[PDB]
Structures are given as C-alpha cells and as structure tokens.
Design a protein around this ligand. Structure first.
Ligand SMILES: OC[C@H]1O[C@@H](O)[C@H](O)[C@@H](O)[C@@H]1O
Length: 470
C-alpha cells in the first residue's frame, strides 16, 4: 500500500527494468565517425531561436565517445535492459543506400551492443526517434512523402542484418505522435513547419499516415525476413497522456476525454489494431484524413509483437466552444478542477504529476486496443531548473524518487488490473538534450556535469533503483 516500499520482488521474475536514451539526445559526435546530418542538426543550427539557450546535439552528453562509461554506469545500476535508438543518419549518412553504408557507425552500435551484453544488459533498440536524415528531408520532404516508407525499410533491414543476431527487441518508431504534431502542427520541433511553408491542418495527417506505413512495412520486413532466423520481437512506442473528463458526470466531457485519447493515442493504435483511423478522427477530420488501401490495412492490422507506452502526465478535458490538427480535436484541456490542479508541477509547467494516469492509460490501452504485451517504454520527471546547486544538493532528487516509486507502483496496479506489462523503462538514464528545451531540463537518474566533460554521477533515484530493482 506504500509506494516507497515498491521493489523487484513485487513483480514477476521475468519483469524487465531499464532506462532509456535516444541518439540525438545523448550521442554527440554529430559529424564524427561518418554520421550525416538529421533534421534536428539542421533545426538546432539554422533555427537556434527554437531551442532554449540556442543549443544543439553536436556533443550532447557525448555517449558517442563515452559509451564505455555509460555501459559501466548501466552495469553499476544493475537494471536488466537499456533502451536506446539508432541514428538513421549515422549508419546511412544519406538516408538511402545510395548515400553509402557507414561501417564506422555500424561499428559504434556493435560496440555499444557488445558492451551491454558482456555486462548482462539487454539492448532495446528503436530505429526512429525523430532524427530523420536531412538528405531525405531535402530530397522529398522526409515523412511528408510516401517515398519515406521504402527508405525506412531499407534502413530497418540494414539494422536487422547487422545487429539482429544480438538485438532481440526492436521498436520501429518512438512517439510518432510527438514527431507529427510538433514538427507539422505547432512547428516547435524539427522540421519546424505549421506555426509551401507548412499547413497544420493537412501535413500532420500525411506525416502520421506515412509514419504508420513506414512502421507497418518495417514490421512486415522483420516478420517475414528476420524473425525466424533471429527470434527477436518488434513493436513501436507511443506518446500517451491521460485524459480525464473535467466533470466526472458530464456526457460531453466523457466524450471529449475519449476524443482526446482518440486524437493522440487512437490515431496510431487503431490503424495497428483494425487498419483504420478512429471513427471520431474520421468524423472530425473528414477529407483531410488519408485513406488506407485494403492492402495497407492488411499490413497495418496486428503489426507488432508488443507496444511501448510513454507516460508523463494527465489533463482534464472538456468540449471546445482555418483548419488545424489542434482545433480538429475539438476539445479544451483544463489543468484545474475548481482551483485544484490535477497534480503538482515538476520542473516543467506542462508536467503535472498524476501517478494514477500511468495506471489508467495501461488499463485503457488493453481495453480499447487489446494489446497482448505492453512495455512502459518511458516514464520519468524533470528536475526543478536551478544552476545554484552543488552536485550533492542537485543529486538529491526527492521528487523524482517519489515520482518513479509512485508510477512504478501504478504500473504494478495496472498489472493487477489485467494489463500484461512486461517491463518498465525510466526516462532517462542521463540528463540529456531535451529538444526545444535544451539542457536545462534534466530527466536523468544520472546527473551530468555540463561544466566538466559531462561527468556522470548517480542521483539518489539511481541508487534507489539499483538497491530496489537489481
Ligand atoms: O519530454 C521528455 C521526453 O519525452 C519523450 O516523449 C521523448 O521520447 C524524449 O525524447 C523526451 O526527452
């Protein structure tokens, strides 16, 4: 009943605990080892006004050079697994085969994977975590063009071929919701369209459509061409946020909350469940929502071995009072129920701590989508922004420790509920490059000293994880 007491021994023996990262956020060596640029290099370099402090991932926290140090920290941490992504423009600088296959980039991922394995840590590997190769962006518009589908398969194939003998858990995409909405609706993430210069009412829908197609076609490639020989599993990780009706007993708000789930999570989950978009998206987006061919529907339906969910926060939802994705949802998000916020702020004013949400999002996904195997692929919280603190003060992350305890507890509740969760990955292992927010937003269980070669030092939360989840 007390969440500070939660530990490995409240979970099945085969439950996988881990931490996470993504290539652009930690690797650095952006022009080292033959890596070609991604749309994020381009965004952060051409439009440093879009980044808090105008920073980028040229060096990030230097896991490109310090990977042996991350492996040692992961080993000391004692958790089962490490979720990281492959930088598409590292292994294929030009995005397609014709831009050349980068042997040194492959060698880096082999070294990381080998390091992880020699230390009993399972690699969980995401192919696409937003770093679309600039060459593809430039040649045809990246995910705006169906040409992205074939190129992504050839990339997935290269990765299965090179790494599949040792990597047994693959995700095609991480958070295409976030990628689609902030790249193409709000224009706040790479490639920064939407705020032809963009169109927030059409482009997010093509992007998501192509993302879904890319995902389906790479899953089919894995299933048909690698799975028998390699015996791994492939899925995808989705952005989630719990949507609670503003008024418990208002039919309108219950529908509004369900529509909000529909536009965020249903948007990707229904295609991979029934091969179509949610009814409410069809109704509210009309002719601006693309149709799948029957062949695409066959390919999308059931196209995963597992689904990863990413969870941070929650919101109340109510009905709303030219065209844009944001206005299509026809909802208004509310944070406060009569001056009572759904939960307290973290270091970020958008992250309201509501641990129960992770439980309701799990329960909701099993019910609505009937996913057989679920991983929490991301869950975590950011430190209050404060450059005044010494490391000993900074590393006492009480709020994170409680946040993890409380969420992990709720994951356990979801599993009692019937949700088959097979592991849980904290976001993140390292303080890292937090997209539009730069370095000031620290999600790590390992503190990074940005004044000193990105020195790693475990925060209280890492110590507790080691001691409680070995
Ligand atoms: O916002 C915190 C984190 O959110 C997750 O959805 C993304 O996958 C990470 O790349 C990001 O750093």
């Amino acid at each position: 009943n007390d969440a500070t007491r939660i530990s490995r021994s409240d979970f099945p023996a085969d439950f996988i605990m881990g931490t996470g990262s993504s290539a652009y956020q930690i690797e650095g060596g952006a022009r080292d080892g033959g890596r070609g640029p991604s749309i994020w290099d381009t965004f952060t370099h051409r439009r440093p006004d879009m980044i808090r402090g105008g920073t980028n991932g040229d060096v990030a926290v230097d896991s490109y050079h310090l990977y042996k140090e991350d492996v040692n920290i992961l080993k000391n941490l004692g958790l089962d697994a490490y979720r990281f992504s492959i930088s598409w423009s590292r292994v294929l600088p030009g995005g397609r085969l014709s831009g050349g296959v980068n042997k040194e980039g492959i060698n880096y991922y082999n070294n990381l994977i080998d390091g992880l394995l020699a230390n009993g840590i399972k690699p969980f590997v995401t192919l696409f975590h937003w770093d679309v190769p600039q060459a593809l962006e430039d040649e045809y518009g990246g995910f705006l063009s169906p040409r992205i589908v074939d190129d992504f398969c050839e990339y997935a194939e290269l990765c299965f071929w090179e790494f599949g003998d040792r990597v047994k858990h693959w995700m095609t995409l991480n958070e295409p919701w976030t990628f689609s909405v902030h790249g193409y609706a709000t224009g706040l993430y790479a490639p920064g369209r939407g705020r032809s210069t963009g169109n927030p009412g059409t482009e997010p829908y093509w992007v998501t459509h192509h993302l879904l197609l890319a995902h389906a076609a790479a899953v089919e490639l894995y299933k048909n061409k690698f799975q028998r020989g390699q015996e791994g599993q492939i899925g995808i990780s989705h952005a989630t946020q719990w949507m609670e009706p503003w008024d418990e007993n208002s039919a309108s708000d219950v529908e509004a909350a369900a529509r909000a789930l529909d536009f965020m999570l249903g948007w990707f989950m229904e295609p991979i469940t029934s091969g179509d978009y949610p009814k409410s998206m069809k109704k509210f987006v009309g002719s601006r929502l693309p149709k799948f061919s029957p062949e695409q529907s066959k390919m999308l339906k059931g196209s995963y071995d597992f689904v990863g969910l990413n969870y941070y926060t929650a919101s109340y939802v109510t009905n709303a009072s030219n065209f844009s994705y944001n206005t299509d949802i026809h909802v208004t998000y509310e944070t406060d129920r009569n001056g009572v916020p759904i939960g307290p702020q973290s270091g970020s004013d958008w992250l309201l701590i509501y641990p129960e949400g992770i439980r309701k999002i799990l329960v909701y996904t099993k019910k609505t989508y009937n996913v057989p195997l679920i991983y929490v692929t991301e869950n975590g919280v950011d430190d209050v922004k404060n450059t005044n603190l010494t490391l000993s003060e900074a590393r006492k992350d009480s709020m994170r420790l409680k946040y993890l305890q409380d969420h992990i507890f709720n994951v356990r509740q979801a599993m009692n509920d019937g949700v088959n969760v097979k592991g849980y990955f904290a976001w993140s292992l390292l303080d890292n490059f937090e997209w539009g927010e730069g370095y000031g937003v620290r999600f790590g269980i390992i503190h990074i000293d940005y004044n000193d070669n990105f020195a790693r030092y475990p925060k209280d939360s890492a110590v507790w994880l080691m001691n409680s989840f070995h």
